[PDB]
Symmetry: D2
Subunit: 58 residues, 4 copies
């Protein structure tokens, strides 16, 4: 079952930074559980990452 849900606040654990709300999901063979995250600093900009790259915060 899904690690995050819509609206969870998450950030990238390492490397390039990103922080904001879960706004969608995707699934490919390379990334069977991926999420779309809308930046809380840059409204409207969305980046997609594998679940292993993300952690939930407050």
């Amino acid at each position: 079952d899904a690690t995050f849900g819509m609206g969870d606040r998450v950030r990238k654990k390492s490397g390039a930074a990103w922080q904001g709300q879960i706004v969608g999901w995707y699934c490919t063979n390379l990334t069977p559980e991926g999420y779309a995250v809308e930046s809380e600093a840059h409204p409207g900009s969305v980046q997609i990452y594998p679940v292993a790259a993300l952690e939930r915060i407050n």
Copy 2:
């Protein structure tokens, strides 16, 4: 209700090209209906677009 479903083959209508399968979805205020599309030419690479930017093909 959703314009596309998982696995639909879609392409960008104009501007930068992209073509492949729907592999997810996202929703923000700027893009209330968006999709993740995995390239059929470049497996594993995914880009996200608003529904208005995409059209279904075969």
Copy 3:
């Protein structure tokens, strides 16, 4: 000649937000003058945009 130089602080004019420093450049037929911009809120994350999408700030 180039509208921006390395290190200029710029933001997206409209739509999805982005703000930070110019860190590179690109040129294609669709985007003959494009820039890479590293977010000032999310260090390490870089997005690329056409010059017409960007404006210089302080």
Copy 4:
């Protein structure tokens, strides 16, 4: 000095696929030597990667 030049044909070595021509460059602390690559399959679409992720082909 730079590993690639404008117009070199390159591909991603591993993970998500990408192949096409070098069309620009970028430099950040996380990625001190990065390149913009326009897909040869999807004209106009550009992705950016660190040099270590790319290899030159024919």
